[PDB]
Design an enzyme around this catalytic site. Structure first.
Site, PDB file in Angstrom:
ATOM      1  N   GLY H  29      35.248  41.795  46.293  1.00 28.49           N
ATOM      2  CA  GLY H  29      35.084  42.092  44.888  1.00 28.49           C
ATOM      3  C   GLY H  29      36.399  42.393  44.198  1.00 28.49           C
ATOM      4  O   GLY H  29      37.430  42.638  44.822  1.00 28.49           O
ATOM      5  N   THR H  30      36.355  42.357  42.869  1.00 29.50           N
ATOM      6  CA  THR H  30      37.535  42.666  42.077  1.00 29.50           C
ATOM      7  C   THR H  30      37.864  44.150  42.172  1.00 29.50           C
ATOM      8  O   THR H  30      37.006  44.984  42.472  1.00 29.50           O
ATOM      9  CB  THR H  30      37.322  42.273  40.614  1.00 29.50           C
ATOM     10  OG1 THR H  30      36.316  43.109  40.031  1.00 29.50           O
ATOM     11  CG2 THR H  30      36.895  40.819  40.512  1.00 29.50           C
ATOM     12  N   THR H  31      39.127  44.478  41.917  1.00 29.04           N
ATOM     13  CA  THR H  31      39.584  45.852  42.058  1.00 29.04           C
ATOM     14  C   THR H  31      38.991  46.736  40.970  1.00 29.04           C
ATOM     15  O   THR H  31      39.065  46.416  39.780  1.00 29.04           O
ATOM     16  CB  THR H  31      41.107  45.908  42.002  1.00 29.04           C
ATOM     17  OG1 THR H  31      41.654  45.089  43.040  1.00 29.04           O
ATOM     18  CG2 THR H  31      41.595  47.335  42.179  1.00 29.04           C
TER      19      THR H  31
END
Lengths: 203, 244, 194, 228, 223, 236, 171, 232, 197
Positions: H29-31
């Site tokens: 997933g994105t940060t």
């Protein structure tokens, strides 16, 4: 009052080493007398049960206790005793307490191992009433109470026990509108049971 | 779906595996006498700091019936809880007296058999020696297996040392045994089985014998009996070992 | 309303009224208040409007189910037991069947006629003669006077004639006569010349 | 509990095997009685013989049930059969016929071979008795598949093949055993082919008696001296 | 690891969900775009009659499908149920964003619980409410994206690239439904490798326009 | 498939339960509990690998009830599940039977739940070993430890974790040479910390330990500042 | 209840739909002369103006229940396309006041369609033979023709099963 | 291999493999990060631009629960929404039974019990999201971070996603060098920008003083100040 | 479905049953150890015969009987043979953990009607009407005999002709069903007289 619809009375007395249980034979729809053959005393071996009250409930409980004592005898490989049967009756009445059966049972019998008389009754509170002298049930309970309380004496011989219990039943039935049309008396001994039909007022 | 199923040979596999679990269990034994039953077992410990007195391998089911096990302890604990529950609800509340040993053993066997035929449940990994007294059958000793099969025994042993224990009991057991001699023979058979330390704290005995009104906890009701089951205390066992 | 039964030496005779009254008027004067439960068992029934026929057809279905299942004719004693169980269970249900029944049968294994009276509470009783409701208040005295266990079917029919005449004379309502059916070793038949 | 590609049900066949490993049971019906028998297997010294239950169990005053297979399952079947025998009386005030109780037990056994989440009973049963107010004996068999059949004589359990071969050439259909003595003689003879006996005789009017060890001893002595 | 919707793969992927996403690539292209005033759906039906690719949920909203049509029927009926419930309990026109989130939360259930399968249909929802014209893209994984324009189904990448290049233009088309529909029909064209009056389907909703579908002769003037 | 669900293998073993035992050590923290004359002390290593964690929240000691405290060895999710269930059971007992649940009753109830997981194939065992400590109203200071197999037993003193055997060896030696005879709970806490240090051969700061003390009518956990005082008193 | 990696889930009835009515035809294909030919109900009525040519019985029962329920609820005949969804290879044929005569086989409407083992050639024969000006007579005779290589729905008659010998003789 | 195809199975090592695979799903997933300030918490997340066609400010990722709890997660976004929906149900039920809004640690325990329950049975899948959540309640600011295993701890600063390591490297420096809410927003923007090494920076925060303890999104001038600070 | 095909195999191992319907009646015939010592009435007008697992036939027969009585209880009219066949077929369908390994011939008359009815059901739950049919082991051979000895344009005219055709087909118990709830099983000696002739 559902118990008063059919009437009838049961009385049990203790003698010397023997028990007597007696009931009237009338089945009626209130004032109308229907049958003179509705015996209210059943036996499940050597233990006798007299059931007064609503006749449908009498038949239902007779069937239920026949079922339960037959299974008990099969599982235990022994016949049910008067005390164990009294507990069984008490617990079975309780299992229907909400929406109860309109009955008053009377257990009578001789414990086969100790060989000594046993009679017990069950009241509206459901309390087991195990008595050394006599148990009465039915519409003429008052008449029976006074009659037995005056006539009964301890340690009656079987031939005297018969006369005492039959007189108690006959004179109480004569004064109860819903009881009569004949009476049957069981004299229960260690070895045998004698069943007798009494001559009485047919009105 | 059922986890216990017939194999092509007709054997139930999970039942065999549960019997193996039992055969790995610690040795326990029971001896029936003319005037009592003694059931004994030895108590291994998870650590020297563990308080072994907190776990009882011999348990009271009714004041006249007691059980010891061999196999998996937690299974025995839950099965004993169920046995007490059923002995009270399904018999005593109905008949006013505690069930005889035969009927309570039949009901324990019923519980164990259901786990052998219901889906999603494995068999109980314990065998029970159930000793009891009842008025009509007298003293009796029953062994109950993971499958729910149960047989009566004059004397028997279950667990790790069952073969040697049974060979010894066959020689020692005889009629006209008094319960004190049964206790003596039980202690000898258990001593010959225990390889560790052997004393009143590593051994657990209970007896079905005479009624103990002093343990009844009340007085004044002449027709009440008092328990016939009685665990021998650590000191009571030790004094007998000092006379072994 | 009127349900009468008499057991004689060789047969059971059941009589039932023909009228059906809903409120202000007599809807029907030829109603048959009996169901054949079995080739040798017959059930008369009486009581409140819908319950009678509903219960009768339910009982008939269950008795026929038993008979087909066991390839055996249930005895009148067993049929009356089943009917009593059904009535005694419903009396303590949400909606009881308020139905009174007379079950007259010929037991082929004992070769004896049998008559059972069961009220809506489940009060089964085996009788020589029976009558439900107010009909017994008039007929029981005549039956006590004249009944003999040894009567033939003809004498039992004559005694039913007497009972029905008494009911017509003294009971206020017009029940439009009776249908009389005889249960015998030969099965069930209906008396038309009554 | 699912069909094999050839249409057999695997679990039912394996339950039949489990029955075949079980201890023997045998029954013969004569003119007036049915006799059931089994070998005690009392070779163990410490078994409590005096309280050990017999193989034959009463279901009702007029019916007895014997079995071979898993004992634990047999007890479940026995309790269900007893409950049904009493329930039939409670519903219709007559005792069960032997046919009715046999059908009930067979239906119970069948239901476990089709319902999911349960395994079949590894028990085959011999049901013997007399119908109410009747005097002709009835003998029936049930096995895990759920089917049942009537028999004049039958054996189940281990060594059933051998003693069934014996029975086939000793029982005569045209002249079946005429008395209790001949039935007991034939039953003991059949069991002695397999190498102490318990014998149960069920007779009309709910007469069920377990023959005493002395009585079987006399029967065995007669049979043995006949063998010589 | 791909046998059921519950199993994570060692790399952390849900293979069944990705297979459901691949199911959409088997469906014919549908295109969506909007200005602030109007939102348009353009669908390539495929045949036999050309199955209708547009579904009307309300006067203020509607949707089109790519992939397994029965899943489209289920999701659309659920969307109607939610809109009717909103108008029943609040007399409130369900917002397009909230409808999209309801679809998102419903479909995600099938990707986590055993016994079900992900919906093998991707939906484009257009609507108009107090916030203006809206366009949402729904995917079997549950993800919902609010977009200026998009295309889903087989070979939709060409239409999506055309929409990307044309974005500067068609966002400015306020109050001119015809130019938006022309841009949409042009966009869907690049996904072909043609359009007929019966093959093509067009739908539109906006400030004055209630949601309407053009089929047959109605789409002729836009081809 | 005997290794994937709780059913017997040919050896009679339940491999899933045995693997659940392995899970208990995967947090790699050791704990020990000792009984004083009139109080019970629990010591547990609070290993904190990340500087961003709030140490106040990292804790495996739970206050099950006013009188009972519980320390868990095993994964924190399962530990919190067990703690919640124990809190619910203690409250339900206090409600149904009118008095605080005894420590051993709670241990038995939890071990029965654990045995249920070991019997029903649908449910996996929790990979937690639960240690309950209290000063019982009747039996006094008590230590009861429950394991994934459904087995439990009372202890004079107990340790749990990867280096369980070393701590148990130290406690065994002390109990041989000598409950822990002290007059106030602080001294027995200091004794427990001392034996933890000696058995593990590792000095502790106020950040490295979490300590729970069971006294009459109260189980409470020591804050880092109190553990600081205890470590200072040991240093003396 | 699973998807393949490629994204896809893991007699002969001939129907012709004309503007004067739809015609359905089937090969009974009795297994033996003993089988009661009357009992081969391989064309069935779903509603007064809907029928189909073929799990079959259960689906047909539910379709009939849905159709009668719609009629009861709305006092109108169910639209065939709505029935297909609200509801063996199927040819569903019926009439309504929205689109008139229809035939369906996920359901796609068809002017004419064939199902069964002969479908792969009957499709080409239909493509070559079908034309819009077919009157019910030619539709019937062309059903019979493509069978060689009955029932109908009309606004006046509704769904009905055929007479048949005569139309064969006229072939 | 063999013990990892079902959610309820222990491997011989005592590790549950399906939960670890869910962690792998989280790592993709994105940060997203969370920062705890002296009187509040700040949430930021990297929103990747899939295409130019996404409307540039209406695909909101940070979710509010009740009014004082904010939630941000990385991994399977639909699973994060499912978890947040359950959290909203829990908070609403608590407010219904008890008129006080749910305390942050209580909410964390409810969510942890829910997530852990998905690791018990074989008929359900673990959550593929690690959720940073927090807020302000009667006893200050709290910052938590769930894991697919159901594990959670309180944090001074939290980060998860593909750039979680780079973000943690800066959270550690923040904690070592300090952080008020105003500065917290700018530092969150800086951390997201540094860890990103197109995307939209979304920020949110709940502080006792600057939001009166209610969760609000950063928008307009403050958002642009944070962005220019990050660019600076 | 595999389980249904294996149920069909179980059916095909079972003892054969045969039925023939004439002008006025339906006749059901059936193929029945040394020490060991089919047609079931569903209602007074309908009989059911089966081939396959005897145990499952009892479940189906009990359900069919219960439904036949429940129909009378809910609707006055007794079940039709068509209705009972449909019900039995549905019951067989629903169970497909394992199907019933039974195929059934269902015969009788409709209430106050005189057209004889004969129907078949199979484990998949498909049912159909037949003028004559056989099921069970070696059913193919005896069915092939029936196809050429039974005549569609001139079926058997009397009970004697139907019984003769049934016995010849079987070459034994025979059940004859006639209107107005007339069901009778032929005596052993009657069947012997048919066989010898």
């Amino acid at each position: 009052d559902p118990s008063s619809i059919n009437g009838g009375i049961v009385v049990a007395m203790t003698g010397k080493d023997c028990v007597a249980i007696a009931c009237d034979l009338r089945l009626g729809s209130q004032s109308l007398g229907v049958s003179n053959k509705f015996e209210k005393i059943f036996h499940y071996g050597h233990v006798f049960l007299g059931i007064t009250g609503l006749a449908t409930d009498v038949t239902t409980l007779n069937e239920m206790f026949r079922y339960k004592t037959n299974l008990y005898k099969l599982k235990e490989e022994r016949a049910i005793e008067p005390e164990t049967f009294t507990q069984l009756v008490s617990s079975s009445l309780y299992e229907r307490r909400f929406g109860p059966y309109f009955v008053g049972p009377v257990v009578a019998g001789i414990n086969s191992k100790s060989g000594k008389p046993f009679i017990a009754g069950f009241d509206l509170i459901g309390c087991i009433d195990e008595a050394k002298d006599f148990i009465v049930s039915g519409t003429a309970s008052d008449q029976l109470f006074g009659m037995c309380e005056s006539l009964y004496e301890p340690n009656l011989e079987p031939e005297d026990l018969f006369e005492t219990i039959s007189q108690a039943l006959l004179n109480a039935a004569d004064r109860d509108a819903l009881s009569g049309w004949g009476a049957v008396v069981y004299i229960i001994k260690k070895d045998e049971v004698v069943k007798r039909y009494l001559k009485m007022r047919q009105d | 779906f059922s986890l216990t199923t017939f194999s092509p040979s007709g054997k139930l596999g999970q039942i065999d595996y549960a019997l193996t679990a039992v055969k790995q269990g610690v040795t326990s034994l029971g001896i029936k006498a003319t005037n009592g039953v003694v059931i004994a077992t030895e108590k291994k410990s998870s650590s020297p700091l563990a308080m072994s007195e907190t776990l009882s391998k011999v348990s009271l089911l009714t004041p006249d019936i007691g059980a010891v096990y061999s196999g998996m302890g937690p299974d025995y604990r839950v099965l004993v809880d169920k046995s007490r529950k059923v002995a009270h609800t399904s018999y005593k509340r109905i008949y006013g007296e505690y069930p005889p040993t035969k009927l309570l053993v039949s009901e324990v066997a019923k519980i164990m058999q259901e786990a052998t035929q219901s889906g999603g449940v494995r068999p109980f990994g314990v065998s029970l020696l159930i000793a009891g007294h009842d008025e009509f059958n007298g003293f009796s000793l029953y062994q109950v297996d993971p499958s729910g099969s149960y047989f009566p025994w004059k004397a028997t042993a279950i667990g790790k040392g069952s073969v040697a224990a049974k060979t010894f009991l066959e020689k020692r057991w005889n009629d006209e045994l008094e319960l004190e001699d049964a206790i003596h023979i039980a202690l000898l058979t258990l001593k010959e089985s225990v390889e560790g330390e052997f004393n009143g704290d590593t051994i657990e005995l209970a007896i079905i014998g005479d009624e103990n009104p002093d343990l009844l906890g009340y007085t004044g009701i002449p027709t009440d009996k008092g328990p016939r089951f009685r665990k021998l205390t650590s000191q009571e066992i030790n004094d007998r070992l000092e006379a072994l | 309303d009127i349900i009468l039964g008499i057991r004689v030496q060789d047969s059971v005779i059941l009589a039932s009224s023909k009228a059906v009254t809903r409120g202000i008027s007599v809807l029907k004067d030829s109603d048959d208040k009996t169901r054949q439960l079995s080739p040798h068992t017959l059930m008369s029934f009486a009581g409140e409007a819908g319950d009678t026929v509903q219960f009768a057809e339910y009982i008939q279905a269950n008795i026929q189910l038993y008979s087909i299942r066991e390839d055996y004719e249930l005895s009148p004693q067993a049929v009356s037991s089943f009917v009593r169980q059904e009535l005694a269970k419903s009396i303590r249900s949400r909606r009881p069947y308020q139905v009174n029944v007379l079950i007259g049968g010929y037991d082929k294994k004992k070769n004896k006629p049998e008559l059972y009276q069961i009220d809506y509470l489940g009060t089964k009783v085996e009788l020589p003669y029976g009558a439900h409701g107010y009909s017994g208040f008039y007929t029981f005295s005549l039956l006590d006077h004249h009944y003999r266990p040894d009567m033939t079917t003809e004498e039992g029919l004559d005694l039913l004639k007497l009972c029905v005449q008494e009911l017509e004379k003294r009971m206020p309502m017009d029940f439009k006569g009776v249908i009389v059916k005889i249960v015998d070793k030969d099965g069930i038949r209906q008396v038309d010349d009554f | 509990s699912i069909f094999s590609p050839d249409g057999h049900i695997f679990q039912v066949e394996y339950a039949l095997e489990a029955v075949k490993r079980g201890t023997c049971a045998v029954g013969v019906k004569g003119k007036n009685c049915v006799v059931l028998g089994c070998e005690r297997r009392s070779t163990l010294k410490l078994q409590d013989t005096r309280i050990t239950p017999s193989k034959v169990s009463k279901i009702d005053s007029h019916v007895v049930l014997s079995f071979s297979g898993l004992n634990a399952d047999s007890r479940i079947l026995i309790e269900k059969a007893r409950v049904e025998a009493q329930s039939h009386r409670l519903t219709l005030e007559d005792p069960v016929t032997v046919e009715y109780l046999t059908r009930y037990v067979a239906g119970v056994q069948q239901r476990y071979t089709q319902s999911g989440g349960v395994r079949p009973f590894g028990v085959s049963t011999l049901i013997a008795g007399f119908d109410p107010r009747d005097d002709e004996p009835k003998l029936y068999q049930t096995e895990p598949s759920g089917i049942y059949s009537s028999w004049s004589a039958q054996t189940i359990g281990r060594n059933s093949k051998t003693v069934r071969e014996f029975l086939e050439k000793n029982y005569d259909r045209k002249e079946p055993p005429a008395t209790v003595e001949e039935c007991v003689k034939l039953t003991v003879r059949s069991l002695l082919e397999v190498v102490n006996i318990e014998i149960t005789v069920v007779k009309p009017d709910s007469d069920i008696v377990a023959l005493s060890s002395e009585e079987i001893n006399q029967y065995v002595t007669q049979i043995e001296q006949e063998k010589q | 690891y791909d046998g059921d919707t519950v199993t994570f793969s060692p790399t952390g992927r849900l293979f069944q969900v990705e297979y459901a996403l691949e199911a959409i690539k088997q469906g014919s292209v549908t295109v969506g775009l909007r200005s602030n005033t109007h939102a348009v759906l353009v669908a390539l039906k495929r045949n036999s009659s050309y199955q209708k690719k547009i579904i009307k949920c309300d006067e203020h909203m509607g949707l089109s499908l790519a992939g397994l049509a029965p899943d489209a029927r289920v999701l659309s009926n659920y969307l109607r149920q939610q809109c009717n419930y909103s108008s029943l309990v609040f007399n409130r026109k369900l917002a397009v964003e909230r409808a999209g989130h309801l679809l998102c939360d419903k479909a995600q259930k099938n990707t986590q619980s055993y016994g079900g399968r992900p919906y093998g249909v991707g939906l484009l929802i257009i609507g108009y409410d107090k916030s203006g014209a809206h366009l949402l893209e729904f995917q079997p994984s549950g993800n919902v994206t609010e977009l200026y324009g998009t295309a889903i189904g087989a070979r939709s990448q060409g239409a999506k690239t055309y929409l990307e290049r044309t974005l500067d233009t068609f966002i400015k088309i306020d109050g001119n439904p015809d130019e938006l529909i022309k841009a949409g029909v042009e966009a869907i064209s690049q996904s072909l490798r043609s359009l007929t009056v019966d093959n093509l389907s067009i739908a539109i909703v906006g400030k004055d326009t209630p949601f309407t579908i053009y089929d047959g002769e109605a789409v002729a003037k836009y081809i | 498939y005997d290794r994937h669900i709780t059913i017997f293998s040919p050896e009679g073993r339940l491999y899933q339960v045995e693997y659940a035992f392995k899970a208990t050590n995967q947090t790699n923290i050791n704990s020990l509990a000792v009984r004083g004359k009139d109080c019970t002390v629990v010591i547990s290593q609070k290993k904190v690998p990340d500087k961003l964690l709030d140490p106040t929240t990292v804790s495996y000691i739970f206050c099950i009830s006013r009188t009972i405290g519980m320390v868990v060895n095993g994964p924190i999710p399962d530990a919190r599940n067990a703690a919640l269930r124990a809190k619910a059971e203690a409250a339900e007992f206090r409600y149904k039977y009118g008095y605080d649940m005894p420590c051993d009753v709670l241990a038995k109830r939890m071990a029965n739940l654990s045995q249920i997981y070991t019997q029903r194939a649908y449910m996996r065992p929790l990979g937690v070993i639960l240690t309950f400590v209290s000063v019982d109203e009747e039996l006094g200071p008590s230590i009861y430890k429950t394991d994934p197999a459904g087995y439990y037993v009372g202890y004079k003193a107990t340790a749990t974790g990867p280096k369980q055997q070393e701590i148990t060896t130290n406690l065994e030696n002390h109990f041989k040479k000598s409950h822990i005879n002290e007059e106030s709970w602080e001294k027995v806490v200091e004794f427990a910390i001392t034996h933890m240090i000696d058995a593990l051969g590792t000095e502790f700061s106020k950040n490295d330990l979490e300590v729970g003390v069971a006294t009459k009518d109260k189980f409470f956990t020591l804050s880092a500042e109190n553990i600081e005082e205890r470590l200072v008193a040991i240093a003396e | 209840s699973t998807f393949s990696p490629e994204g896809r889930l893991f007699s002969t009835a001939i129907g012709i739909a004309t503007k004067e009515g739809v015609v359905l035809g089937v090969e009974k294909r009795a297994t033996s002369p003993l089988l009661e030919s009357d009992s081969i109900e391989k064309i069935v009525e779903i509603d007064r103006h809907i029928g189909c040519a073929m799990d079959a019985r259960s689906m047909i029962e539910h379709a009939r229940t849905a159709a009668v329920t719609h009629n009861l609820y709305y006092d109108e005949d169910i639209n065939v396309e709505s029935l297909t969804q609200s509801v063996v290879a199927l040819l569903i044929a019926g009439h309504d006041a929205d689109d008139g005569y229809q035939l369906f086989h996920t359901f796609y409407r068809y002017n004419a369609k064939a199902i069964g083992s002969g479908s792969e050639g009957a499709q080409a024969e239909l493509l070559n033979e079908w034309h819009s000006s077919l009157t019910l007579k030619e539709a019937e005779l062309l059903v019979l023709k493509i069978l060689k290589q009955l029932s109908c729905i009309t606004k006046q008659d509704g769904f009905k099963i055929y007479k048949t010998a005569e139309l064969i003789k006229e072939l | 291999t063999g013990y990892d195809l079902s959610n309820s199975v222990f491997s011989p090592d005592g590790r549950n493999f399906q939960v670890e695979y869910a962690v792998k799903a989280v790592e993709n997933g994105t940060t997203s990060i969370g920062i705890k300030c002296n009187d509040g918490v700040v949430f930021a997340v990297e929103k990747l631009i899939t295409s130019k066609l996404l409307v540039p400010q209406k695909n909101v990722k940070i979710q509010v629960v009740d009014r004082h709890i904010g939630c941000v997660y990385s991994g399977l976004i639909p699973d994060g929404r499912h978890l947040v929906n359950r959290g909203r149900e829990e908070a609403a039920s608590f407010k219904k039974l008890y008129k006080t809004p749910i305390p942050i640690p209580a909410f964390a325990d409810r969510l942890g019990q829910y997530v852990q329950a998905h690791t018990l049975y074989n008929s359900v899948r673990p959550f593929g999201v690690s959720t940073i959540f927090g807020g302000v309640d009667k006893n200050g600011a709290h910052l938590y971070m769930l894991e697919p295993s159901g594990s959670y701890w309180g944090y001074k600063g939290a980060a998860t996603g593909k750039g979680r390591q780079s973000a943690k490297a800066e959270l550690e420096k923040l904690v070592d060098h300090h952080l008020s809410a105003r500065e917290a927003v700018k530092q969150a923007a800086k951390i997201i920008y540094l860890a990103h090494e197109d995307f939209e920076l979304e920020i949110s925060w709940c502080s006792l003083s600057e939001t009166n303890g209610l969760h609000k999104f950063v928008k307009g001038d403050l958002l642009q100040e944070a962005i220019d600070f990050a660019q600076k």
